[PDB]
Design a binder for this molecule. Structure first.
Ligand SMILES: Nc1ncnc2c1ncn2[C@@H]1O[C@H](CO)[C@@H](OP(=O)(O)OC[C@H]2O[C@@H](n3ccc(=O)[nH]c3=O)[C@H](O)[C@@H]2OP(=O)(O)O)[C@H]1O
Ligand SMILES: [Cl-]
Ligand SMILES: [Cl-]
Ligand SMILES: [Cl-]
Ligand SMILES: [Cl-]
Length: 520
């Protein structure tokens, strides 16, 4: 019955029920003319049961859906709109997010999509408590206290749409306006990136005119040399530059934590020059993709031991300037590309600071592993609960699986995840599969790869560390009644891909695996 799948304590009828929707560039104006199902696309979900218009009670979470899907890491953010139903609306809160279970327990048709039925007159009379329409609600994410609203497409035409914020109107660089907005949530780190950009140029220029530095420059091989030679020279360059007036604050703090040492700045610069080729250097989105999967970014951001130490514009600018200068020195030694170092390197790395600062500005998601974790390259991954490790052979409709992901200290990236499938019968719901980082829900882009495996990459950069923890939520969809056998699946693990490293003179991603148990 209804009390099997409805949370009455979270269900209610409200007048002028409002919620928020994150909107992409190109749509902030047009969406205010009305909510309408797009002619094509997933129209809200991979799964027909879940097709509808999606909103949330939290405008900062809505903002997290506003970035240009063609350029999800570095692209422009559109805005947030507030959608309001006139009259009375029933919010129907669900205790499960399994459509088959919900259709069974609410005595619905098992052969019509759930969200379609939600907008029928019969459903609304049965479950509306007098309201003009029903909206379903679900918890937004692990690590979040926000709510997700799922609106029937035809009923959603009744919505009135107002502007909450248009990020582009602010006329700021990169994703700055979006991240300043999100920081209001907290207050907290809320730096002025315009000031940091200018301080960084002023410091760069300052350093290039420094006697001992440009003399140090003169000593560079200025040619392809080994990684060892390159790192050695760069450590020396760092020592030299750190003595400079404009980096005085940086020098003081530098001895204070091993994370901030020159060796680490040099390793970073080396790694950057190694992965940025001409095509990549010429494209901010590609640059950010490449930088986002490197290890060691905690050194330049001054993040260690659960805290953000580089928490002023001045010291962030000092750190960014020094790293930029070092990247320029490394490119001839090991890279192969002029101007990337003070432009796209700086714009890309600013975006990643913004991401990690936004995570530290959020409450730390449930830090302890609740099952014994798998430990590798500084990461720790565990099944959230034993049940998450089991694929029930007779499951109906869909199944969700939670995996906790942490890292021991500095921020370490999650490049993607490797999910097992079964030819037809068991597929990844690419809409409901996501990663939540201290409650920030990050959508994924998923594609098939060899061996009945689907690879999903987060839309926005994922980092975990001390104080920044994630939940990987895998949503499987059953696309066939035909039963699943315990020996039918080609892959029996979920893979987690970490930072890029070199093995056998080749770039590979750190890999961690958790194994599923298939049983009745
Ligand atoms: N006039 C319009 N009426 C309706 N939609 C319009 C209109 N104009 C533009 N859109 C966009 O069209 C899509 C469907 O509503 C959404 O964008 P998306 O980029 O596909 O949105 C990307 C994904 O984000 C989800 N998402 C988006 C924002 C939000 O706050 N929460 C959320 O969960 C979407 O449901 C979508 O899921 P699926 O990709 O799984 O379908 C939406 O912003
Ligand atoms: Cl999105
Ligand atoms: Cl989650
Ligand atoms: Cl605005
Ligand atoms: Cl590995």
């Amino acid at each position: 019955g209804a009390d099997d799948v409805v949370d009455s304590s979270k269900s209610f009828v409200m007048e002028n029920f409002s919620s928020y929707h994150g909107t992409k560039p190109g749509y902030v104006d047009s969406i205010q003319k009305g909510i309408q199902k797009p002619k094509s696309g997933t129209q809200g979900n991979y799964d027909d049961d879940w097709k509808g218009f999606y909103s949330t009670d939290n405008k900062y979470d809505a903002a997290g859906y506003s970035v240009d899907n063609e350029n999800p890491l570095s692209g422009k953010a559109g805005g947030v709109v507030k959608v309001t139903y006139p009259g009375l609306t029933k919010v129907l809160a669900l205790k499960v997010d399994n459509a088959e279970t919900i259709k069974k327990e609410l005595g619905l048709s098992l052969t019509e999509p759930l969200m379609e039925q939600v907008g029928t007159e019969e459903f609304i009379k049965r479950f509306g408590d007098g309201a003009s329409r029903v909206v379903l609600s679900l918890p937004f994410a692990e690590g979040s206290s926000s709510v997700e609203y799922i609106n029937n497409w035809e009923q959603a035409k009744a919505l009135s749409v107002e502007l909450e914020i248009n990020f582009e109107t602010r006329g700021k660089r990169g994703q700055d306006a979006m991240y300043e907005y999100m920081a209001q949530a907290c207050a907290c780190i809320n730096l002025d990136w315009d000031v940091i950009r200018d301080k960084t140029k002023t410091k760069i220029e300052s350093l290039k005119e420094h006697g001992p530095i440009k003399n140090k420059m003169s000593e560079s091989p200025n040619k392809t040399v080994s990684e060892e030679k390159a790192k050695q020279y760069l450590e020396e360059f760092h020592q030299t530059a750190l003595e400079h007036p404009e980096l005085s604050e940086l020098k003081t703090v530098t001895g204070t934590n091993p994370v901030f040492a020159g060796a680490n700045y040099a390793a970073w610069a080396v790694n950057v020059a190694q992965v940025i080729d001409s095509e990549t250097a010429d494209n901010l989105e590609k640059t950010t993709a490449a930088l986002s999967i490197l290890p060691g970014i905690g050194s330049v951001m001054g993040i260690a031991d659960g805290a953000v130490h580089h928490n002023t514009e001045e010291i962030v600018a000092q750190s960014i300037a020094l790293s930029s200068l070092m990247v320029a020195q490394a490119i001839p030694l090991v890279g192969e590309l002029i101007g990337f170092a003070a432009y796209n390197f700086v714009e890309s790395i600013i975006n990643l600071f913004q991401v990690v600062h936004n995570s530290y500005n959020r409450p730390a998601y449930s830090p302890g592993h609740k099952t014994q974790p798998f430990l590798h390259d500084g990461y720790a991954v565990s099944w959230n609960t034993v049940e998450d490790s089991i694929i029930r052979t007779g499951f109906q409709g869909e199944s969700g699986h939670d995996i906790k992901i942490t890292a021991e200290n500095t921020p370490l990236p999650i490049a993607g995840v490797l999910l097992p499938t079964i030819p037809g019968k068991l597929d990844v719901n690419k809409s409901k599969t996501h990663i939540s980082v201290n409650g920030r829900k990050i959508r994924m882009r998923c594609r098939a790869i060899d061996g009945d495996v689907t690879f999903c990459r987060p839309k926005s950069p994922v980092y975990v560390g001390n104080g920044v923890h994630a939940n990987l939520h895998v949503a499987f969809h059953r696309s066939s009644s035909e039963k699943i056998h315990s020996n039918e699946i080609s892959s029996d693990s979920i893979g987690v891909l970490g930072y890029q490293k070199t093995v056998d003179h080749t770039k590979v991603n750190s890999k961690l695996s958790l194994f599923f148990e298939i049983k009745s």
